[model samples]
Target: AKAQRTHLSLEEKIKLMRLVVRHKHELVDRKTSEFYAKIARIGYEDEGLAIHTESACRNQIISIMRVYEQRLAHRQPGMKTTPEEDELDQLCDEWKARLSELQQYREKFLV
Candidate 1:
């Protein structure tokens, strides 16, 4: 058997981001540990991606959220960042309402 790391598409990651971010306050374990079975079904039955464990989807969102949070700052003309950072910054801009939730999550996850 072979092992390959699966990369979820940006669109797919966006969808998962929406799910987790919008529902940021719903669960007891809001610390990126729930929703494994839910994500597995969405990946296989609805979204057409492979079944990732709760950890995979949840972890992916955390990584995505990191990017989302990283771009929370306004960019200066002097310093350059990753393309994905700007991509997510613009993508997340679609819902200005959710921006507040992103901020909330950012505070919770801060070290």
Candidate 2:
């Protein structure tokens, strides 16, 4: 038996890419949220110092994602500066702030 080769339409490919991007963004959000939750839990038990450091690292990652979002919005035809993009940017900013706060908390508590 021979394998059949199916051709995907351009629209189909675009849809697939959109799905992939959406999923990737979800994972990124999940990771940031998880880090925050972990920091909170750990802070309850131990010193909250590491929370700031970990948060800062997570923020840096979020900043990188923001760059990706900006590039994608600029290049991709349908990625308008709409509510979706705004929401993503807001999340990116939130992560950055959280990271900074965590860093400050670390500095205050750790030393």
Candidate 3:
């Protein structure tokens, strides 16, 4: 069996990106692809998305992060960017902070 293809928009991609970043550590005091499974399920249940599997959600984050880096490079100089680009710039910055904080939390938890 197979699921239908997902037609994600920029709005939905950004929304899921933010949600995953924000709530990641909540379930991430852990190691569970099941975590993403929950995220995928929630996307299907509450939102009108069928993100299907962990790889699906994982790929979305990966895709957004690549865009994040592309935008960050644009920020390297005084190149400037659109309003939305700046928002993603800040959000990706926040994503890094969460990653740092989660690393600390995991270290301490395992210690």
Whole-model Cα lDDT of every candidate shown, in order = 0.56, 0.44, 0.66
lDDT for 79 in candidate 1 is 67
RMSD (Å) per prediction: 6.9, 14.4, 4.6
- For model 2, the superposed segments whose C-alpha errors exceed 4 Å read 1-80
Which ten-residue region of model 1 has the weakest summed lDDT? 1-10
Question: lDDT rank, highest first?
Answer: 3, 1, 2
Tell me the TM-score of each prediction against the true structure. Answer: 0.48, 0.33, 0.66
Per-residue lDDT of model 2, residues 4-83, tens digit only = 33343323223322332333323244465664444434443453222234564345344556684677567756544666
For model 1, residues 1-111, the per-residue Cα lDDT tens digits are 011555646656655545444454444456534555465555566665655677665565557656565657645477677665455565555544455766798789995
List the candidate 3 regions with Cα displacement exceeding 4 Å.
1-8, 28-30, 76-83, 104-111
Better of 2 and 3 by TM-score: 3
